[PDB]
Structures are given as structure tokens and as C-alpha cells.
Amino acid sequence: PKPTKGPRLGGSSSHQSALLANLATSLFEHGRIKTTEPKARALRPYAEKLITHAKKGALHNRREVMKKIRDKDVVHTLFAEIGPFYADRNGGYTRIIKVENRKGDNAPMAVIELVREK
Amino acid sequence: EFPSATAKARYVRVSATKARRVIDLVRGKSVEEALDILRWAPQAASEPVAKVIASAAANAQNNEGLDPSTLVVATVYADEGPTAKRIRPRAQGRAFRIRKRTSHITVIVESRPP
Amino acid sequence: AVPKRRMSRANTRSRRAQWKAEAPGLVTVSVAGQQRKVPRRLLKAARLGLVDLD
Amino acid sequence: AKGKRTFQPNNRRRARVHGFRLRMRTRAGRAIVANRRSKGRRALTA
RNA sequence: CAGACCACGGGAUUGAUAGACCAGACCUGGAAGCCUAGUAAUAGGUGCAGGGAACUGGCACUAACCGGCCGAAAACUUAC
RNA sequence: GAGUGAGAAUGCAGGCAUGAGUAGCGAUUAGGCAAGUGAGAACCUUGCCCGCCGAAAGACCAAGGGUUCCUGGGCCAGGCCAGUCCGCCCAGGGUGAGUCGGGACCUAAGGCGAGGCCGACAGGCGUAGUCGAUGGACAACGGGUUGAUAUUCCCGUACC
RNA sequence: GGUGAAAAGUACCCCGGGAGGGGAGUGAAAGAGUACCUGAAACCGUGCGCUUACAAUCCGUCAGAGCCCUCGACGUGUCG
RNA sequence: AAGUGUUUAAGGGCGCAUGGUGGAUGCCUUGGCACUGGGAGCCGAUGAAGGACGUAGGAGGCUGCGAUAAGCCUCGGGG
Numbered sequence: 001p002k003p004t005k006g007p008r009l010g011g012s013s014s015h016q017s018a019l020l021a022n023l024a025t026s027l028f029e030h031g032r033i034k035t036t037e038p039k040a041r042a043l044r045p046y047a048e049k050l051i052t053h054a055k056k057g058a059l060h061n062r063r064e065v066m067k068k069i070r071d072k073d074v075v076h077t078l079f080a081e082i083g084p085f086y087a088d089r090n091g092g093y094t095r096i097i098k099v100e101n102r103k104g105d106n107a108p109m110a111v112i113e114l115v116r117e118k
Numbered sequence: 119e120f121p122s123a124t125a126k127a128r129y130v131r132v133s134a135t136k137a138r139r140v141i142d143l144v145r146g147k148s149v150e151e152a153l154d155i156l157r158w159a160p161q162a163a164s165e166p167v168a169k170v171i172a173s174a175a176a177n178a179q180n181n182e183g184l185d186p187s188t189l190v191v192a193t194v195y196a197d198e199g200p201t202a203k204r205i206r207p208r209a210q211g212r213a214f215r216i217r218k219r220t221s222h223i224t225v226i227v228e229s230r231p232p
Numbered sequence: 233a234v235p236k237r238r239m240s241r242a243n244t245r246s247r248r249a250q251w252k253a254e255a256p257g258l259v260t261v262s263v264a265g266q267q268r269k270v271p272r273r274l275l276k277a278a279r280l281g282l283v284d285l286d
Numbered sequence: 287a288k289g290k291r292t293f294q295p296n297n298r299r300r301a302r303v304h305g306f307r308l309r310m311r312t313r314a315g316r317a318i319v320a321n322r323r324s325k326g327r328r329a330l331t332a
Numbered sequence: 333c334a335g336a337c338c339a340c341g342g343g344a345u346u347g348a349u350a351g352a353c354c355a356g357a358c359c360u361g362g363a364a365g366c367c368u369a370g371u372a373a374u375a376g377g378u379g380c381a382g383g384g385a386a387c388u389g390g391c392a393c394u395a396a397c398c399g400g401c402c403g404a405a406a407a408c409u410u411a412c
Numbered sequence: 413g414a415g416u417g418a419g420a421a422u423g424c425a426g427g428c429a430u431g432a433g434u435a436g437c438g439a440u441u442a443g444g445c446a447a448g449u450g451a452g453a454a455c456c457u458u459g460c461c462c463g464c465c466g467a468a469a470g471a472c473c474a475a476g477g478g479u480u481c482c483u484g485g486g487c488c489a490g491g492c493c494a495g496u497c498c499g500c501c502c503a504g505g506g507u508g509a510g511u512c513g514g515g516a517c518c519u520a521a522g523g524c525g526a527g528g529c530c531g532a533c534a535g536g537c538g539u540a541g542u543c544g545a546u547g548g549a550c551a552a553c554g555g556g557u558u559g560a561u562a563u564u565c566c567c568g569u570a571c572c
Numbered sequence: 573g574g575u576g577a578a579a580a581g582u583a584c585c586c587c588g589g590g591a592g593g594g595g596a597g598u599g600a601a602a603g604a605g606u607a608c609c610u611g612a613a614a615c616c617g618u619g620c621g622c623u624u625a626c627a628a629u630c631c632g633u634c635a636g637a638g639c640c641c642u643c644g645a646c647g648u649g650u651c652g
Numbered sequence: 653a654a655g656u657g658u659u660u661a662a663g664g665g666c667g668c669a670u671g672g673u674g675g676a677u678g679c680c681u682u683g684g685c686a687c688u689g690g691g692a693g694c695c696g697a698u699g700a701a702g703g704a705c706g707u708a709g710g711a712g713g714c715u716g717c718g719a720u721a722a723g724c725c726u727c728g729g730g731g
Contacts (some may be wrong), residue, residue, distance in 0.1 A: 090392030091353035
């Protein structure tokens with residue numbers, strides 16, 4: 001998606017890519033991950049685009065999500081549950097809720113969820 | 119003079135200036151509003167201040183038998199306390215002084231009419 | 233450079249008054265029957281039960 | 287770099303260069319031990 | 333696309349502000365799988381393919397929230 | 413009768429300001445999530461990922477340190493933050509050798525040095541000796557064991 | 573170096589994890605709480621009164637309106 | 653219409669009231685200084701001065717003591 005405007009999230013481009021991969025893995029695994037607000041905002045597009053690949057059943061999208069996620073359990077979870085789950089929802093597969101700040105460095109915290117009404 | 123309760127958190131491990139930074143947010147406010155502001159204030163010096171104010175309100179309710187809803191932080195101030203002197207080594211073997219400052223936070227809550 | 237002179241207490245105080253905290257704006261939320269006050273940003277989290285209201 | 291500090295410890299060398307037997311060996315060292323004892327030091331030698 | 337912060341400028345459900353989704357434009361340059369030619373490297377078809385960011389237009393799917401703090405007037409003299 | 417009067421001596425000591433809630437928070441690896449503990453968790457525990465060293469940033473000796481090791485507790489001080497954690501603090505425990513490394517074996521350089529020679533004195537040297545390893549000689553290897561010890565303990569089989 | 577005459581050093585309440593405090597108690601005194609006789613200044617607050625955001629200030633001094641308190645008077649709120 | 657006038661305090665100053673820190677002042681003392689008059693004027697291979705390590709029922713420091721280890725015996729004072 002749209003690159004990071006400022007300095008990259010983890011401390012470098014490579015660490016940001018790895019961090020987005022791991023946050024997306026946890027998001028798809030738990031449905032609900034609490035992480036610093038900027039990380040959540042950076043992850044929303046990343047995760048939604050992986051879910052877009054998962055929404056369509058194709059080996060090509062399977063392989064794309066794999067080259068992003070690298071966690072076969074969660075890739076199956078995507079393409080088996082979260083794929084058909086959002087069969088009819090068209091975008092905005094996830095939600096960001098701002099929560100209290102972290103007591104250590106007062107960082108802004110937010111939970112990313114996957115939407116579950118329909 | 120409205121009835122009042124005191125509470126002195128002495129030798130708090132917070133610089134008096136930083137305790138004051140959070141005291142100013144609450145001085146004169148109701149006890150309930152003061153506690154909410156201190157709860158949501160980012161400043162870590164807010165926890166000692168909130169505890170002093172809560173102790174003042176508790177003393178008002180128990181030792182003074184006052185209605186909590188009528189309490190407001192009348193006079194709250196943080197004074198300097200004893201300073202511990204530490205040494206921070208620096209370049210060319212020069213020793214600078216670090217000051218581990220403390221504060222005495224005094225709260226005095228008054229039972230004002232509605 | 234180093235401060236050439238001790239700053240007068242008036243100047244010290246006037247510049248030091250600028251180091252102050254902003255009071256957070258508190259909005260009412262209904263959690264567990266009783267009413268609590270939380271930042272409007274955390275209003276949704278409080279409604280969803282995501283805020284540890286002590 | 288070459289950041290070798292001056293005091294490279296060695297207990298054998300310390301004892302043999304500043305120790306009690308060395309100090310007692312010579313007149314000056316015996317005088318040093320006696321002067322240290324008169325001052326009241328607890329550690330008369332290495 | 334405003335910016336050190338602050339400010340400035342838009343939007344805030346009576347909404348297209350951002351993201352996503354759908355298209356397009358662009359960049360890249362022919363994806364994966366399968367089939368075929370191959371003793372194989374590899375090549376051809378499927379197929380201006382596939383992957384994609386910032387640009388464009390749609391689309392309330394996600395977030396702009398059952399909110400909070402500020403914020404409005406002594407009169408008098410003279411002439412008309 | 414004076415230790416008799418301080419505002420200056422880049423005076424001395426203690427306490428404090430100013431700078432300022434400022435610089436800095438110590439490399440060139442990088443953390444994340446979930447779940448626990450807790451009053452409190454970015455920093456502790458566990459799991460899963462990610463990343464870093466890999467002629468080391470791994471393992472073990474020696475020097476040096478000296479109990480820092482392990483167990484259980486503690487979180488006022490210290491840790492450049494906080495800390496429930498810690499090489500911190502408290503108590504208790506913990507180091508097992510005929511073979512390992514040393515001495516009881518040996519000498520090198522060097523030291524000391526009976527007498528001795530030299531020197532006003534103090535002392536300087538030095539023979540015989542005697543110490544002096546960084547060297548020579550010298551008998552043990554596998555596996556297991558504890559929360560902490562292991563070629564030491566234990567098992568098996570060897571060697572003085 | 574200095575609590576107090578004596579430890580009588582806060583059995584049992586409350587807020588807090590603790591620190592610390594508020595009660596209640598001992599004490600002649602807690603304006604003596606193992607941080608302790610007296611408790612100066614520097615320094616740091618808080619409250620109240622006046623004053624200041626058109627101003628060029630060795631930060632005073634001399635005149636000085638206004639405002640805020642005090643002592644008298646008369647017994648009008650104004651003069652000393 | 654033209655003139656006359658408030659009242660702000662984000663902050664600051666000054667005065668006062670109240671505190672906090674700090675440990676000056678006053679008053680002290682367990683210590684030290686300078687002397688006076690006396691005693692002793694040496695201790696050591698019968699191992700000194702001075703120590704190390706131990707020693708109490710319990711962890712350390714000081715004191716005492718020395719594997720007979722805060723001690724053993726004898727003779728006196730004392731209650």
C-alpha cells in the first residue's frame with residue numbers, strides 16, 4: 001500500500017516489513033492484537049490487502065499471501081476461514097480502537113480487530 | 119471556614135516541579151474531577167498526586183465524617199524534599215552531580231456546599 | 233556557549249511557566265451501570281470494554 | 287586501540303614488590319613498616 | 333502536497349476526509365498453475381499476463397464516535 | 413583578656429539556585445504479538461514469530477575479581493526510564509581429587525645468602541646453600557548425577 | 573553528635589502495594605514522631621493585597637494618582 | 653456623530669501570611685588541647701611492639717580472650 005511517509009516503523013525498512021508481517025500474522029491468528037497506535041495504522045492497509053488476497057480463492061493469491069506472511073497455519077486460516085468470511089464485505093475488513101497509553105513510554109496504543117457483524 | 123481534611127505524602131520520589139506540573143491541573147477542582155483528571159493525565163507524577171488527593175478525601179469521609187461529593191481540592195501544593203546527591207561520570211573523567219529530588223505533596227480538601 | 237549571567241528570577245519564572253501539562257478533556261461513558269470519565273479518543277474503547285477503568 | 291591501563295594486577299608481584307617480607311628485608315622498608323604501625327594503619331604492607 | 337511542535341487547510345454520517353474494495357491511469361514487462369517443444373538449460377500458448385504505492389472516479393465496508401471546554405455589553409458630556 | 417566584627421583572597425566547607433525540566437540516557441543486532449504474574453509491565457515469565465553473532469556476541473582455561481554461583485524472599489537505594497526483574501539487597505545453601513592445577517619433585521632468569529670479601533657507619537657484593545615457573549619429571553578415562561560440585565561425587569573399567 | 577524526664581518510639585480505625593499520611597492515643601510539648609532540641613539564610617511552594625501585556629527599566633531615589641489595610645476624630649463618610 | 657472611562661493576567665514584580673528544604677544560631681557534650689603534681693621510666697628468644705585467624709547459643713564491628721579461647725586457678729574487696 002501507500003509507503004510510510006516518515007521514518008519507517010521498526011527503525012528501518014526491512015524491520016518495518018518484518019514487523020508488519022508479524023503483526024499481520026498475529027492479527028490473523030488472534031483476531032484482536034493490541035499494538036502501538038502508529039503500528040496499528042500502518043498494519044490496517046497491509047492486513048486488509050492480505051485479506052483481499054485471501055478473499056479470492058486462487059493458488060496465485062495463496063502464494064502472494066505466503067510471500068508476505070510466511071506462517072502456514074495463519075495462511076490456511078486466512079484462505080479457509082477469513083476468505084469466505086468476507087465473501088460479501090467489500091473492504092474495511094478490520095477495525096482500530098484507540099485504547100489507553102502504555103505506562104512505560106506513554107505510547108499511544110490501539111487494538112486492531114477483524115470485523116465480525118456479518 | 120468549610121470543614122476540611124489534610125493529607126501529606128512526604129518524601130515522594132518525584133521532583134517537586136514535576137509534582138506541581140500535575141497539581142496545577144487539579145488545584146481548586148472537585149475531588150471527583152481532580153481524580154479523573156489525574157487518572158487520565160499522562161504525567162507519571164500524577165499517581166502520587168492522585169493518591170494524596172484520594173487519601174485526603176478518605177480522611178474527610180472517615181476521620182471527619184464528611185460527604186465525599188461535597189469535597190474539592192482546596193489547597194494542594196508540592197514542596198521540595200530531601201535531595202540525594204549522585205555522581206554521573208562523564209568525558210575526560212569529570213564527575214557531574216545528579217540530583218535525585220523528592221517532594222512533599224500536601225493536599226487539603228474542603229467540604230463546600232453544592 | 234554558556235549562560236553569561238544568572239537569569240533573573242522573573243525571567244526564569246516566566247519561561248518556566250510555559251512548561252505545563254494540558255488538562256485532558258473528559259467525556260462521560262456508561263460502564264457497568266456507574267458513569268466514568270474518559271478521553272473522547274478512548275470513548276469507543278470504553279464502550280467496547282477495552283479500557284481498564286480502575 | 288592500545289588502551290592498557292597502568293595498574294595491571296598481579297597478586298604474586300604485588301606481594302613480592304610491596305609485601306611484608308620485602309619491607310622487612312631492608313632498613314628503609316622496616317622503617318616504613320614501623321612508621322605505618324605508628325600511624326596506626328591496619329594494612330602495614332601488601 | 334500543511335507541518336519541527338504549534339499553526340494553517342479540509343472532513344467529521346445531512347460524510348468520500350483517510351484506509352480498504354472496485355475500476356481506471358501509470359510503472360514493470362509477460363505471474364502462478366497447466367499444456368506443449370524439448371535427453372536439459374530453457375522456450376512457446378493460456379495472456380498488453382501478473383504484480384503493484386502516491387494520480388483519477390466510484391463505493392460508507394473500516395474509522396471519523398450516544399461529547400467535552402470555552403464563548404455575548406457601567407455608563408456619561410456634547411451636538412443632532 | 414580577646415580566635416572581637418568579611419562582601420570580595422579565580423578564598424575553604426556545607427546547603428542551594430542559574431543554565432533547565434534543558435543536553436544526554438553509552439554504538440555500528442530489532443523487536444512484535446499472545447498469554448501469565450503483579451497494585452503497577454515496552455523492559456519480568458512462558459509460547460510463537462522476527463532479527464543479530466556464529467574464528468563469536470559460542471564453549472573452556474589462566475590472570476584478575478571474591479561469593480557476584482544456587483534456592484527462597486525484597487523492591488525504599490543502585491540499573492542512566494520503570495521494573496514484579498537484576499551481577500542490587502536479605503537469609504540459607506553451595507566448591508568433595510592418590511591421577512586435574514600447584515606444594516610435599518627439579519631446576520632457569522632472578523632473589524636471598526652461613527661463613528666470607530669489600531666498605532668510616534649505613535651498608536655493596538657474593539661462595540656453599542636456598543628459594544624461584546613461564547620450563548623438566550610425574551598415575552584416569554567414558555557415562556550419569558544435583559538447585560548449585562565434578563577427570564573430585566556415583567556407575568564401569570584403569571592406573572600410583 | 574543533640575527525640576523525650578522516661579520509649580511512654582503511634583497493640584485495635586481509615587486511604588495506600590509500599591512510602592506517607594489522617595484518626596485515635598503517649599507526652600508538658602508531637603509548634604519533640606527514631607527523617608526527631610533550637611530551626612537562620614540561601615533556595616522552592618501555596619494563599620491573599622496592589623501592580624503590571626504601547627513598553628527601552630545599575631532595577632533605585634524624590635514627587636506621586638489610584639487601590640488595599642490599620643490607628644484616632646467626629647459618631648453622616650470625610651479629615652488627620 | 654464626536655469625545656470621556658472601566659474592567660483581562662497567559663505570566664511577572666513587590667508586601668504580607670503560611671509552609672517545605674537546609675542546618676546556621678543559642679544552649680549543651682561522649683571528645684580534644686594545654687598544662688600541674690606524682691608513679692613508671694623500659695618491653696623482648698621464658699618469644700616483644702604489633703598483628704592474622706579464631707573464641708559467646710545465636711550474623712558482623714568494637715572489647716576481652718587464645719583450641720583451657722568475653723575465658724581457667726589462687727588470694728583479697730564487695731555485697
